[PDB]
Design a protein around this ligand. Structure first.
Ligand SMILES: [Ca+2]
Ligand SMILES: [Ca+2]
Ligand code: NA
Length: 274
């Protein structure tokens, strides 16, 4: 039995998949804690590790495996189903098994993804500050045609305070916040002017080591829905630029309330890809 996590129909990815568009030959780099490549519900094509002592195709934390399955869990008779199940998945390990990484390692992963011709970068990670080198790297990736997506952060709200993390806060990166299965904002989801769109992030079931499936909460779970949605759009409209894909995602989002809390709202990939 394959479970369809609620987020797949919530963003209308099932509608696009049913038309025959599944992200085939779209290269998506998951910059995270690695991916358990031996998981039966994932195919990892390649990647690189910028974390000492850990190979790209293992995951001692679980976070990267979970994020990867939201993008690209295989469409078969077991496990779960990704947003873009035919995506070429690359594991770019920039976080260690404890979930942390240096700015230099993250920059190295972004550069690797740009040089190696990735179509989409997903960064389910963030910090209170970024760095000048990180901004350079994401700006160059976006200018070279990569759709760059990141988790907005899990700092919630505090009056009028902007709680968006980096790299999500950079203008060349899509900052993604989290809703739940009722399409309500999750209380942990960061807020602020740079918030761009929302996606499912509370109660997200996905692949998890070893060879299993688990539920996690976070804007880290929301980001890969948007990365996967970008891959569906590209599979249907292969000639679009990165800015055109980005504008399709935000312009066609379902409004949920104030942009401070939701950005343009919940992505709708059926509308975005039409
Ligand atoms: Ca579910
Ligand atoms: Ca599956
Ligand atoms: Na941004």
């Amino acid at each position: 039995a394959q479970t369809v996590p609620y987020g797949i129909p919530l963003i209308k990815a099932d509608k696009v998949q049913a038309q025959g568009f599944k992200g085939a030959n779209v290269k998506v780099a998951v910059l995270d804690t690695g991916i358990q490549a031996s998981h039966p519900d994932l195919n990892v094509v390649g990647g690189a590790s910028f974390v000492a002592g850990e190979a790209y195709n293992t995951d001692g934390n679980g976070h990267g495996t979970h994020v990867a399955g939201t993008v690209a869990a295989l469409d078969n008779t077991t496990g779960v189903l990704g947003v873009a199940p035919s995506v070429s998945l690359y594991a770019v390990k920039v976080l260690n098994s404890s979930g942390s990484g240096s700015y230099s390692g993250i920059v190295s992963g972004i550069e690797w993804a740009t040089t190696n011709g990735m179509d989409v970068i997903n960064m389910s990670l963030g910090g209170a500050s970024g760095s000048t080198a990180m901004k350079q790297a994401v700006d160059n990736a976006y200018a070279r045609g990569v759709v760059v997506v990141a988790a907005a952060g899990n700092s919630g709200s505090s009056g009028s305070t902007n709680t968006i993390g980096y790299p999500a806060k950079y203008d060349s990166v899509i900052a993604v916040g989290a809703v739940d299965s009722n399409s309500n904002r999750a209380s942990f989801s960061s807020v602020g002017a740079e918030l761009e769109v929302m996606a499912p992030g509370a109660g997200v079931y996905s692949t998890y080591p070893t060879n299993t499936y688990a539920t996690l909460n976070g804007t880290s779970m929301a980001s890969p829905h948007v990365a996967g949605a970008a891959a569906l759009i590209l599979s249907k409209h292969p000639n679009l630029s990165a800015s055109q894909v980005r504008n399709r995602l935000s312009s066609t989002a379902t409004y949920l309330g104030s942009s401070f809390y939701y950005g343009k709202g919940l992505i709708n990939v059926e509308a975005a890809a039409q």
